[PDB]
PDB file of N, CA, C and O in Angstrom:
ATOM      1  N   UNK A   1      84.619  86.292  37.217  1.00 52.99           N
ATOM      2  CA  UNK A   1      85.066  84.905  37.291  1.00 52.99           C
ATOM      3  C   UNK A   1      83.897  83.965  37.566  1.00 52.99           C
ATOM      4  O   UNK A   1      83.485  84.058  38.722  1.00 52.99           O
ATOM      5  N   UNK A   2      83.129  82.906  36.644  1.00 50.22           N
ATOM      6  CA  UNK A   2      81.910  82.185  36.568  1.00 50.22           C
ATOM      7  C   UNK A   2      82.203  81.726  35.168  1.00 50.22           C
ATOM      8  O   UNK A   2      82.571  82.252  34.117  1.00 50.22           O
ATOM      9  N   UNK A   3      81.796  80.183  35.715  1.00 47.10           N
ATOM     10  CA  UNK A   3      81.994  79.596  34.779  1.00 47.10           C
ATOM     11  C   UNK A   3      80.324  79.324  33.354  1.00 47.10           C
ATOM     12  O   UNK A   3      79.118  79.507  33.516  1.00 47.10           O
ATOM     13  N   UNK A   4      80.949  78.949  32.396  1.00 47.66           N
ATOM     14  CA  UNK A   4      79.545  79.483  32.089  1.00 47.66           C
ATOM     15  C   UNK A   4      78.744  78.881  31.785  1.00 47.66           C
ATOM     16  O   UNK A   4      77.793  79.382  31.186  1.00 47.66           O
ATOM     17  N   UNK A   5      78.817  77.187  32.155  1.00 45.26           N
ATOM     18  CA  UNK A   5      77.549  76.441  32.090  1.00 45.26           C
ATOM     19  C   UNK A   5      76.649  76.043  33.625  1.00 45.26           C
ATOM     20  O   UNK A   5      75.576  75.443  33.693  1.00 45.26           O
ATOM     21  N   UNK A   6      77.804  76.808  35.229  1.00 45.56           N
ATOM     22  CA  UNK A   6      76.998  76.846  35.870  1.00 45.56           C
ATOM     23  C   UNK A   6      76.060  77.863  35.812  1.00 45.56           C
ATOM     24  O   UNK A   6      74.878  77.599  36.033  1.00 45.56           O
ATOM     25  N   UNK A   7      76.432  79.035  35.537  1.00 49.41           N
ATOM     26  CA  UNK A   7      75.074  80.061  35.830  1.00 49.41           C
ATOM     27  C   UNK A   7      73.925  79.937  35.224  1.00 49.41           C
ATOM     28  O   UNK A   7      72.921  80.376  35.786  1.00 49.41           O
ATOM     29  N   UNK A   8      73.838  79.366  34.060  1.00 50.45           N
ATOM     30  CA  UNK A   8      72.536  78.873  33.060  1.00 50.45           C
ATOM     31  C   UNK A   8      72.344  77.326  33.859  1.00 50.45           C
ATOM     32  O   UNK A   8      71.130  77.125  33.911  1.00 50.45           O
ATOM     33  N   UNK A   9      72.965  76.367  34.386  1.00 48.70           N
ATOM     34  CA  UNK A   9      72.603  75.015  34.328  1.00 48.70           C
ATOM     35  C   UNK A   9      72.086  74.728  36.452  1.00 48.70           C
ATOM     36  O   UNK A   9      71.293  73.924  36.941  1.00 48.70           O
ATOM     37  N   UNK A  10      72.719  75.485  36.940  1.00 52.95           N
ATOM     38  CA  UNK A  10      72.692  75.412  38.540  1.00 52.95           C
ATOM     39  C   UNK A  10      71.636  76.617  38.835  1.00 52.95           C
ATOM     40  O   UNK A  10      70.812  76.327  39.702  1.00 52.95           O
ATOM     41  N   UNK A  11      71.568  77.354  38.514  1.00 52.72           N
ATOM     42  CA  UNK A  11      70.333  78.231  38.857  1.00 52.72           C
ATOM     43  C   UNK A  11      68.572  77.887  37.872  1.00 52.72           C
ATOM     44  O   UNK A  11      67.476  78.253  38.297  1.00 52.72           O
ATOM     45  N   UNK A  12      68.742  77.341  36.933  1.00 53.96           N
ATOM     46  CA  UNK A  12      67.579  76.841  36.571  1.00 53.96           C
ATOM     47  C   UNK A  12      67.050  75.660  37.395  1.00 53.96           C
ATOM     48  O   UNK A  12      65.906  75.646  37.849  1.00 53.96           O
ATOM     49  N   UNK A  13      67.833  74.786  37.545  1.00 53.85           N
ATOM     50  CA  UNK A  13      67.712  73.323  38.351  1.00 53.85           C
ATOM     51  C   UNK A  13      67.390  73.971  39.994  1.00 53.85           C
ATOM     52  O   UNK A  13      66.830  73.216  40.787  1.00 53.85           O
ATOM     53  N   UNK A  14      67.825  75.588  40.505  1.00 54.72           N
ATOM     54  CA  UNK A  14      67.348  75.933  41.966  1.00 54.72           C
ATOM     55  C   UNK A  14      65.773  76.130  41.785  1.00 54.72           C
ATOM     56  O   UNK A  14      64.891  75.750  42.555  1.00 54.72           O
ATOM     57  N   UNK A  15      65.638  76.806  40.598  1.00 52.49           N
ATOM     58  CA  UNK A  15      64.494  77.327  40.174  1.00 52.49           C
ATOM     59  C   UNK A  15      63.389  76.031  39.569  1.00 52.49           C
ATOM     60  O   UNK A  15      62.207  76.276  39.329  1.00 52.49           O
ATOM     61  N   UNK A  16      63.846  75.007  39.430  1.00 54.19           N
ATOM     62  CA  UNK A  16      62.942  74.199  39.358  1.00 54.19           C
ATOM     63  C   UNK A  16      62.893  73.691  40.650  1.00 54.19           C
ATOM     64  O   UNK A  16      61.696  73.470  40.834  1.00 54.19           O
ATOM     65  N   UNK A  17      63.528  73.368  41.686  1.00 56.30           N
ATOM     66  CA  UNK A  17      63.295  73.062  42.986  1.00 56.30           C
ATOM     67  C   UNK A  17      62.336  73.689  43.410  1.00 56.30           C
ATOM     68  O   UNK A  17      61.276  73.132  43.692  1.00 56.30           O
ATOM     69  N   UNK A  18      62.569  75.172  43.552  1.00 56.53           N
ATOM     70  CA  UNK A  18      62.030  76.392  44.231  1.00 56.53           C
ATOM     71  C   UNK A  18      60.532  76.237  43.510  1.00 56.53           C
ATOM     72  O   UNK A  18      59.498  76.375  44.164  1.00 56.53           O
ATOM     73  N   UNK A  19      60.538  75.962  42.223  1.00 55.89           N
ATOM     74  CA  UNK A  19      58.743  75.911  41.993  1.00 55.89           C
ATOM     75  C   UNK A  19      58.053  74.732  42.612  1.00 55.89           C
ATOM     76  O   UNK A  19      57.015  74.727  43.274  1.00 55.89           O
ATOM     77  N   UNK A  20      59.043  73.459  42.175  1.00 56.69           N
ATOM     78  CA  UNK A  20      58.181  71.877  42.943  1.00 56.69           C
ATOM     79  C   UNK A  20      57.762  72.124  44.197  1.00 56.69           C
ATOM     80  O   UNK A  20      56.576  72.011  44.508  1.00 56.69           O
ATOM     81  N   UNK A  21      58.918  72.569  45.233  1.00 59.65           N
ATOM     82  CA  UNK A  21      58.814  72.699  46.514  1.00 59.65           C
ATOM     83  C   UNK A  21      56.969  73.592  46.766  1.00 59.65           C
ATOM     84  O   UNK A  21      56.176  73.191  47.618  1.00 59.65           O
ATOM     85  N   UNK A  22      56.684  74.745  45.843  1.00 59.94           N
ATOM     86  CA  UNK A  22      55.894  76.018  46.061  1.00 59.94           C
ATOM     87  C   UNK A  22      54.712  74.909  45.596  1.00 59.94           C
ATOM     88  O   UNK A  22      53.726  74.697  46.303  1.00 59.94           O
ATOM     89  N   UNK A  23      54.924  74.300  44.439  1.00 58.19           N
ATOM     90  CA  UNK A  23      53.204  73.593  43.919  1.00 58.19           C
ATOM     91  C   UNK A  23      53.156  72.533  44.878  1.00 58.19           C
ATOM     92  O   UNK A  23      52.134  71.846  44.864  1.00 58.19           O
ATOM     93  N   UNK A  24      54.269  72.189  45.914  1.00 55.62           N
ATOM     94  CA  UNK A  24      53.645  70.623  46.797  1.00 55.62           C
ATOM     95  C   UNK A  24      53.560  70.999  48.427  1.00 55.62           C
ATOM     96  O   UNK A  24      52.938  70.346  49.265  1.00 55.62           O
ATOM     97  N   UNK A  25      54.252  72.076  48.640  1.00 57.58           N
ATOM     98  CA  UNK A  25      53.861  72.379  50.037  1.00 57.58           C
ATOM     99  C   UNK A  25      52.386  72.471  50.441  1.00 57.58           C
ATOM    100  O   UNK A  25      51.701  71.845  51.250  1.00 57.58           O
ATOM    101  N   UNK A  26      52.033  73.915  49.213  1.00 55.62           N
ATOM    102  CA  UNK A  26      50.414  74.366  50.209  1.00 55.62           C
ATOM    103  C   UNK A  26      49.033  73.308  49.860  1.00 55.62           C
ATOM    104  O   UNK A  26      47.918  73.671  50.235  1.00 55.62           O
ATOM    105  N   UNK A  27      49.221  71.894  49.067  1.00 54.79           N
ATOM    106  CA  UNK A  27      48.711  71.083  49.056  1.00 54.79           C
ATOM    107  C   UNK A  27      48.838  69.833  48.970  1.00 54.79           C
ATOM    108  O   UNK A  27      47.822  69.180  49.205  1.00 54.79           O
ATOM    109  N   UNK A  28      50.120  69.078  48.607  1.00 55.91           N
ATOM    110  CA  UNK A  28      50.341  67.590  48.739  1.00 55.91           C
ATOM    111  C   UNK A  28      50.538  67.392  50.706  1.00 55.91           C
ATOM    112  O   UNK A  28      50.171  66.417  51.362  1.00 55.91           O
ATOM    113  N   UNK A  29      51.124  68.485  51.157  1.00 54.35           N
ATOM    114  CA  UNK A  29      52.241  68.230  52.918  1.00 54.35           C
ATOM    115  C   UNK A  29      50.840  68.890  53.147  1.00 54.35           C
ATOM    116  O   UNK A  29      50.420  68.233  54.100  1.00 54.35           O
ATOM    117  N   UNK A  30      49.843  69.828  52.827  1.00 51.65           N
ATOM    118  CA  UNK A  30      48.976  70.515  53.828  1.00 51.65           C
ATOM    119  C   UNK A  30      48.121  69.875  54.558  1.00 51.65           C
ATOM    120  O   UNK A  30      47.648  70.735  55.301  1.00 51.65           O
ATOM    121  N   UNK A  31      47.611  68.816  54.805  1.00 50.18           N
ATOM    122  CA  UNK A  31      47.104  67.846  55.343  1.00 50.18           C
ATOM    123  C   UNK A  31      47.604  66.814  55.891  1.00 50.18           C
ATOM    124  O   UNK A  31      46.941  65.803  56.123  1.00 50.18           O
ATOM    125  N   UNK A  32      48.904  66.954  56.178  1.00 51.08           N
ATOM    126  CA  UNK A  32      49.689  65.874  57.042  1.00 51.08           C
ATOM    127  C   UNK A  32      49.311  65.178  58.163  1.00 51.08           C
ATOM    128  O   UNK A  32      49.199  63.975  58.399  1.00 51.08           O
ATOM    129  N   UNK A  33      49.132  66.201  58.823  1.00 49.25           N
ATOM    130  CA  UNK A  33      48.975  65.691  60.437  1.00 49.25           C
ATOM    131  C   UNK A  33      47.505  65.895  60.696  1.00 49.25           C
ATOM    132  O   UNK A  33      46.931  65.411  61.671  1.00 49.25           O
ATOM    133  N   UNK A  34      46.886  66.687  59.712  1.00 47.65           N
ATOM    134  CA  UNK A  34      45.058  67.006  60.246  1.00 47.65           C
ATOM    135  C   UNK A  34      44.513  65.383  59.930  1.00 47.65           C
ATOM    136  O   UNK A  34      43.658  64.943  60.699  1.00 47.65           O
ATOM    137  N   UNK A  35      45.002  64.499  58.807  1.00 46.51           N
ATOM    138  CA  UNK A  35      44.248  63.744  58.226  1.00 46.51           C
ATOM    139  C   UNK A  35      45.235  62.995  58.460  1.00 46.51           C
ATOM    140  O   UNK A  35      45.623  62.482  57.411  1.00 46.51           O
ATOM    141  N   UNK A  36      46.024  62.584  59.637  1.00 44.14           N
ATOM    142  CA  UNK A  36      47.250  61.395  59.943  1.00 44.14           C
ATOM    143  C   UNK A  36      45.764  60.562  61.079  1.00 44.14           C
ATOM    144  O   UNK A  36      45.241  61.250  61.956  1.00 44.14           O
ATOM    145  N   UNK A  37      45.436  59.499  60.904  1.00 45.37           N
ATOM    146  CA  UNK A  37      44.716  58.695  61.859  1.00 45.37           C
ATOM    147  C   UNK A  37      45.237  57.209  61.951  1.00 45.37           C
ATOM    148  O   UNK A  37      45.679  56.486  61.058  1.00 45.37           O
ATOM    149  N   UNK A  38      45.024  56.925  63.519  1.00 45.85           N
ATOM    150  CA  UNK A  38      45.158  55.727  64.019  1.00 45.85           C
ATOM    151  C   UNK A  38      44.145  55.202  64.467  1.00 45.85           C
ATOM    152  O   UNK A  38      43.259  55.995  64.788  1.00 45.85           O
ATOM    153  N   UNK A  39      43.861  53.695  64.671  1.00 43.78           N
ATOM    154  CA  UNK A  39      42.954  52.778  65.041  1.00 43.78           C
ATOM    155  C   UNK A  39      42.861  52.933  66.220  1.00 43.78           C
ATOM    156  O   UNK A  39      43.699  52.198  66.743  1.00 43.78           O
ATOM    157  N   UNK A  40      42.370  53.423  66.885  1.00 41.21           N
ATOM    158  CA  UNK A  40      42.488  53.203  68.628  1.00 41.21           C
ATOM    159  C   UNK A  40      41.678  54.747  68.954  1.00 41.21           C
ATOM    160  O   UNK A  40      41.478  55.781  68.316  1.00 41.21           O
ATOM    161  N   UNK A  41      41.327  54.189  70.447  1.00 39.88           N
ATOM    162  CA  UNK A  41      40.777  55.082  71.531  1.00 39.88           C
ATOM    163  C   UNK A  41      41.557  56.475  72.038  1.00 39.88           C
ATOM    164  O   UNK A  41      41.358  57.586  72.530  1.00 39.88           O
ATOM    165  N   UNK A  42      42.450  55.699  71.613  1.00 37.50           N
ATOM    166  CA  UNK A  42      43.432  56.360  73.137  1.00 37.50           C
ATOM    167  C   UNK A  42      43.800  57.505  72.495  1.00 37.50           C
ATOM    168  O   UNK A  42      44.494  58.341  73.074  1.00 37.50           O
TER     169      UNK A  42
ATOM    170  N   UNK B   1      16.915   2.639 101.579  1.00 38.48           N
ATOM    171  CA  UNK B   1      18.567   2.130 101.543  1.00 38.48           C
ATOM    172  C   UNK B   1      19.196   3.864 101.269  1.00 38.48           C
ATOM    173  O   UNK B   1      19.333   4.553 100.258  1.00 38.48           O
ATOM    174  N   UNK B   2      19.422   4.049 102.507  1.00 35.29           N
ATOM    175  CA  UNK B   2      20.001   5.689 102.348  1.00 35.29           C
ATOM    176  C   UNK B   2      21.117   6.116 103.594  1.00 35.29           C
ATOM    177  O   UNK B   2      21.018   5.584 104.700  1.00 35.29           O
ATOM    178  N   UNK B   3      22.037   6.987 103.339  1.00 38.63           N
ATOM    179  CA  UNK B   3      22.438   6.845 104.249  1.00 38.63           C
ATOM    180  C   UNK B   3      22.648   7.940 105.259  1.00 38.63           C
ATOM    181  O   UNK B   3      23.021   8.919 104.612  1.00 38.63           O
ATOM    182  N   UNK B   4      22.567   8.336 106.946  1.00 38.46           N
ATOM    183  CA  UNK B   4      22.197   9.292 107.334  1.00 38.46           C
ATOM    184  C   UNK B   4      22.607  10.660 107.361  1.00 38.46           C
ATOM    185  O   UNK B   4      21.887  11.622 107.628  1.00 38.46           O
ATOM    186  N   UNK B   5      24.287  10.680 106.951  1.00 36.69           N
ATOM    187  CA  UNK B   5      24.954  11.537 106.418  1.00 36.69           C
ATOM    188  C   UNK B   5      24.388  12.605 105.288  1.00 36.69           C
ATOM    189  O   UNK B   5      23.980  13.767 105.309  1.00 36.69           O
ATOM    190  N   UNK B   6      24.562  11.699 104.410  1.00 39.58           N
ATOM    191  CA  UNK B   6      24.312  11.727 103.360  1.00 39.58           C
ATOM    192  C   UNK B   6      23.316  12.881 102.717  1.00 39.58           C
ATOM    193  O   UNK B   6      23.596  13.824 101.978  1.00 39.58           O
ATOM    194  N   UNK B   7      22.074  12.466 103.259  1.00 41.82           N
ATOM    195  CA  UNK B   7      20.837  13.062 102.890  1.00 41.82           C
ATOM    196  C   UNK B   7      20.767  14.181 103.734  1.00 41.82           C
ATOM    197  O   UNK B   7      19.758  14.813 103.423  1.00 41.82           O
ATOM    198  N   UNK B   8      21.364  14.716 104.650  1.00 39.26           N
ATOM    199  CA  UNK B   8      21.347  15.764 105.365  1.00 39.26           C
ATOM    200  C   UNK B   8      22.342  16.405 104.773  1.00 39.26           C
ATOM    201  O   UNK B   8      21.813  17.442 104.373  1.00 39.26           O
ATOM    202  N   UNK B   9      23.574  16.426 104.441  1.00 34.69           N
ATOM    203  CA  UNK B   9      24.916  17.351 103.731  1.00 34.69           C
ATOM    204  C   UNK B   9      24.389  17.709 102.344  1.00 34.69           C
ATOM    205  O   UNK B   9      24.056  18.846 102.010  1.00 34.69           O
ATOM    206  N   UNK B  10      24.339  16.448 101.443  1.00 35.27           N
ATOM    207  CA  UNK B  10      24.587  16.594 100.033  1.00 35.27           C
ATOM    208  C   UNK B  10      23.185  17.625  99.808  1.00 35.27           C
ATOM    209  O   UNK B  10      23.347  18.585  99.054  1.00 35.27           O
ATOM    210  N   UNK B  11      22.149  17.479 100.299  1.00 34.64           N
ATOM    211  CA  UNK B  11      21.186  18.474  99.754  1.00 34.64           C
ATOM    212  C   UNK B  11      21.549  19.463 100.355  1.00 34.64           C
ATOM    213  O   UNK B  11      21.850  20.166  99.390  1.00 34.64           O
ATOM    214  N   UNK B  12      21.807  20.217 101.442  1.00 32.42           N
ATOM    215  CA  UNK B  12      22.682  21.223 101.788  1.00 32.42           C
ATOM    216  C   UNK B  12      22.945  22.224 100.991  1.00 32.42           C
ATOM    217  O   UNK B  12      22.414  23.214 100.487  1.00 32.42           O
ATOM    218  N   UNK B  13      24.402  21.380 101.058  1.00 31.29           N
ATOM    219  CA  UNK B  13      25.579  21.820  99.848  1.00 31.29           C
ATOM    220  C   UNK B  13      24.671  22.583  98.492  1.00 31.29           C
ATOM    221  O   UNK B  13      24.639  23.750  98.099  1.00 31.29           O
ATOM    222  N   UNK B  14      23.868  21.124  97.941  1.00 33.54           N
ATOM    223  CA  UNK B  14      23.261  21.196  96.501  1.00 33.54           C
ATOM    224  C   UNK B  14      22.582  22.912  96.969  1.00 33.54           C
ATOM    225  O   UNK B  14      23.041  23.905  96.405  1.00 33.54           O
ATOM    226  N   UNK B  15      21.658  23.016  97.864  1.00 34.78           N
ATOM    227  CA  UNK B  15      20.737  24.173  97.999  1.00 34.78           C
ATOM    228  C   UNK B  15      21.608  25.576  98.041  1.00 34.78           C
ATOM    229  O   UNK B  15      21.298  26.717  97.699  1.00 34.78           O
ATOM    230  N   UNK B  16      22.748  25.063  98.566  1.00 35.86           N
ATOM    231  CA  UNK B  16      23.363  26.187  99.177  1.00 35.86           C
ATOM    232  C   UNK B  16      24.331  26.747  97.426  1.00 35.86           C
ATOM    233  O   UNK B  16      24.655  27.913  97.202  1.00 35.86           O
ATOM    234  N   UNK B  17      24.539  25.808  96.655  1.00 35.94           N
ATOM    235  CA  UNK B  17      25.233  25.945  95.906  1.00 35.94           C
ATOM    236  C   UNK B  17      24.239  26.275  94.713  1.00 35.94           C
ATOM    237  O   UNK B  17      24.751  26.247  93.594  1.00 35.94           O
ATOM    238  N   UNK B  18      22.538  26.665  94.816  1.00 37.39           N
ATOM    239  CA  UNK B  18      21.344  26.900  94.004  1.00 37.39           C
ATOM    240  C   UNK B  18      21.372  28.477  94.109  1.00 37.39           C
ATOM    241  O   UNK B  18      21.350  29.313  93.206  1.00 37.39           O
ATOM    242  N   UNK B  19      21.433  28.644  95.572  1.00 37.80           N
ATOM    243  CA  UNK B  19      21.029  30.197  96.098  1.00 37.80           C
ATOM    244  C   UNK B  19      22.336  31.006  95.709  1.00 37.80           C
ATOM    245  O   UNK B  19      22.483  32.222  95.588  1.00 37.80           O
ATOM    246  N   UNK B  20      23.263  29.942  95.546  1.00 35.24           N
ATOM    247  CA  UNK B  20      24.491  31.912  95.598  1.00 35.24           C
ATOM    248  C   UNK B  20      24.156  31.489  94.068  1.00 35.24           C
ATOM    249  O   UNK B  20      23.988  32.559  93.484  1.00 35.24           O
ATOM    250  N   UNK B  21      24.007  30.580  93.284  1.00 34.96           N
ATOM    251  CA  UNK B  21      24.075  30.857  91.827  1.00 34.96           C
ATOM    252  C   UNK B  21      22.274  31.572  91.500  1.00 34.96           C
ATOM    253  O   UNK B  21      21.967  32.030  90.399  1.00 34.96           O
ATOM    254  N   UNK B  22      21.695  31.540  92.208  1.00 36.09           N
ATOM    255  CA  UNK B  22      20.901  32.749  91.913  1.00 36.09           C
ATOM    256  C   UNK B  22      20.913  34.380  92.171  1.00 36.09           C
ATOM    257  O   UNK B  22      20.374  35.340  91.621  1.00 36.09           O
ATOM    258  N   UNK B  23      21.893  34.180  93.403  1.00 34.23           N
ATOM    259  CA  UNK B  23      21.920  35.367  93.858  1.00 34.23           C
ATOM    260  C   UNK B  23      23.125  35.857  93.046  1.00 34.23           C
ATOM    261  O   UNK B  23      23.103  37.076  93.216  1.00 34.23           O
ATOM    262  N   UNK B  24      24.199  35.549  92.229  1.00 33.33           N
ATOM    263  CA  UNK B  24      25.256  35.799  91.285  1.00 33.33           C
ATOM    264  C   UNK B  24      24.545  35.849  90.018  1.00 33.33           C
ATOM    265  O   UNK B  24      24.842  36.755  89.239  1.00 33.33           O
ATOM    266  N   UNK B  25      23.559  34.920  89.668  1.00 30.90           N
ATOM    267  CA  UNK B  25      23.331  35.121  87.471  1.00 30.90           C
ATOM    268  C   UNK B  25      22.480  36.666  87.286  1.00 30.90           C
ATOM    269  O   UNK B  25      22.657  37.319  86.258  1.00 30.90           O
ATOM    270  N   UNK B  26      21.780  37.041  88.116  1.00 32.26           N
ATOM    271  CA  UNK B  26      20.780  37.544  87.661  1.00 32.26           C
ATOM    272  C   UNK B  26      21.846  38.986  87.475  1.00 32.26           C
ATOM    273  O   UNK B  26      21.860  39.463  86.341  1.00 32.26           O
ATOM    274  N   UNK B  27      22.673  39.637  88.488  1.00 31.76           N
ATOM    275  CA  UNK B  27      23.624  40.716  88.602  1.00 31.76           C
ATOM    276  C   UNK B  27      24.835  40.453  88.979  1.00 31.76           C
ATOM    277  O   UNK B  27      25.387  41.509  89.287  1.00 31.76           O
ATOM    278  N   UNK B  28      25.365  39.754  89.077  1.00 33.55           N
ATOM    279  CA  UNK B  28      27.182  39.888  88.899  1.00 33.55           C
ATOM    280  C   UNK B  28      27.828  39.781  87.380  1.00 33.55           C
ATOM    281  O   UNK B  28      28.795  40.383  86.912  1.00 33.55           O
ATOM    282  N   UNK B  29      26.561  38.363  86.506  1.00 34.24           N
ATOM    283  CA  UNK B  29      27.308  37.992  85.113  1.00 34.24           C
ATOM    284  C   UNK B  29      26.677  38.475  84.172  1.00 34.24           C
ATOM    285  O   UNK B  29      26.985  38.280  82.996  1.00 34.24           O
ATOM    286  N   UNK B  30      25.146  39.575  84.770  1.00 36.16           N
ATOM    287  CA  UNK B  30      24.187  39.885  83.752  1.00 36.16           C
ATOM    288  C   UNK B  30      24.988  40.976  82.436  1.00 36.16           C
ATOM    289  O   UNK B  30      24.673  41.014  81.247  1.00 36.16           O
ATOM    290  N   UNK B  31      26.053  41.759  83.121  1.00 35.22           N
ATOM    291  CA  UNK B  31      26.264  42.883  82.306  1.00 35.22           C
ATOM    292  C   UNK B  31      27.736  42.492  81.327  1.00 35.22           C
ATOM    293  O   UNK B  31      28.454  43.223  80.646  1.00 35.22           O
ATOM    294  N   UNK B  32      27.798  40.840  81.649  1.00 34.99           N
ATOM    295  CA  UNK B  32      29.249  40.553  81.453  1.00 34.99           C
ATOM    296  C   UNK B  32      30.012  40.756  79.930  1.00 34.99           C
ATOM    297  O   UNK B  32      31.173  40.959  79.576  1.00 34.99           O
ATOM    298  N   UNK B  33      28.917  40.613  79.349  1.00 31.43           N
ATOM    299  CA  UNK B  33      29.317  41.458  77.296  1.00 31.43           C
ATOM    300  C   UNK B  33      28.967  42.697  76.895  1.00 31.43           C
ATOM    301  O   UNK B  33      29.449  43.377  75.990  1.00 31.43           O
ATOM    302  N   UNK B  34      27.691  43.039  77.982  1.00 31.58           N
ATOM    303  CA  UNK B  34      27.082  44.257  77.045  1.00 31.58           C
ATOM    304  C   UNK B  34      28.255  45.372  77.831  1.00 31.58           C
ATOM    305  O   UNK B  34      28.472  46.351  77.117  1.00 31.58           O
ATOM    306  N   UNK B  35      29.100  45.376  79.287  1.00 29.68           N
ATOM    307  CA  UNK B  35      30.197  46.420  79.931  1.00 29.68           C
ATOM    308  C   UNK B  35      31.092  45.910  79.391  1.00 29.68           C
ATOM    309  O   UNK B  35      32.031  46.680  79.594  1.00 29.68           O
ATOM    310  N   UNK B  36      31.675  44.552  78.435  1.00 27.97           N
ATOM    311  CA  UNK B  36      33.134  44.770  78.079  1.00 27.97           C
ATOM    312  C   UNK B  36      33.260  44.998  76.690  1.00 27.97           C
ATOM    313  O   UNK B  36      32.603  44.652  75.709  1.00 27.97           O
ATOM    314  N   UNK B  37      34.561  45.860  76.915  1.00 27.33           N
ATOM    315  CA  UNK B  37      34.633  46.996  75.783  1.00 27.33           C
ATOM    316  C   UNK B  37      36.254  46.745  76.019  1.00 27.33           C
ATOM    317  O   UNK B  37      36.896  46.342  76.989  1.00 27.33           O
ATOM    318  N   UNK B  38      36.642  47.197  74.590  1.00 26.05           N
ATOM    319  CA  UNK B  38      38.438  47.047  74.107  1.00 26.05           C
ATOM    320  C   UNK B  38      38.279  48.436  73.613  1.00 26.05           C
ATOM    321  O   UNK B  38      37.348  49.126  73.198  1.00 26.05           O
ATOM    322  N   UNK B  39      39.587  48.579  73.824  1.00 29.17           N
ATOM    323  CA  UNK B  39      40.536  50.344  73.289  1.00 29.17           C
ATOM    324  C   UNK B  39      40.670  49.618  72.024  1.00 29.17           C
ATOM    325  O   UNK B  39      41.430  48.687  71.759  1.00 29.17           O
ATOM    326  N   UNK B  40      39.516  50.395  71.052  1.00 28.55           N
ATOM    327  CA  UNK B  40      40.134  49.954  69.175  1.00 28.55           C
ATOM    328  C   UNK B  40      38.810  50.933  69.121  1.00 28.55           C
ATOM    329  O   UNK B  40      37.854  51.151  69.865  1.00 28.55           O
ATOM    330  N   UNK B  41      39.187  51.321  68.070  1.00 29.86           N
ATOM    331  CA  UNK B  41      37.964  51.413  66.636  1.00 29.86           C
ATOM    332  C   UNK B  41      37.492  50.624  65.836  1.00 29.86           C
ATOM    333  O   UNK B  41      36.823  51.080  64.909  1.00 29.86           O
ATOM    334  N   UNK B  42      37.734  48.942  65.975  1.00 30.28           N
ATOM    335  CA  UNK B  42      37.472  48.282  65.065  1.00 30.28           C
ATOM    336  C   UNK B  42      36.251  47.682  65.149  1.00 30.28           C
ATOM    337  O   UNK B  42      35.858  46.953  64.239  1.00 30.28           O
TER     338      UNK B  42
END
């Protein structure tokens, strides 16, 4: 019981998540907080 | 034409008001820009 334009149309669209997420984590987010700066002393 | 007050106080005062401003410019106001400093990086 599956219907049959989710299993081709909802698991490709996870699988394009699942790659964006993999090419922007270990370099767009990897420098977040090392290279986050503020004006000040303190 | 002077009067006896006068010439005994006002130079006084004047002398007295020579010596603390010597004894204040040279070290109380000497360091007064080059020690102030602000919390910035700018």
């Amino acid at each position: 019981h599956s219907t049959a334009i989710g299993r081709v149309w909802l698991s490709v669209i996870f699988i394009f998540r699942i790659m964006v997420l993999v090419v922007a984590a270990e370099s767009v987010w990897g420098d977040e907080k090392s290279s986050f700066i503020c004006n000040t002393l303190q």
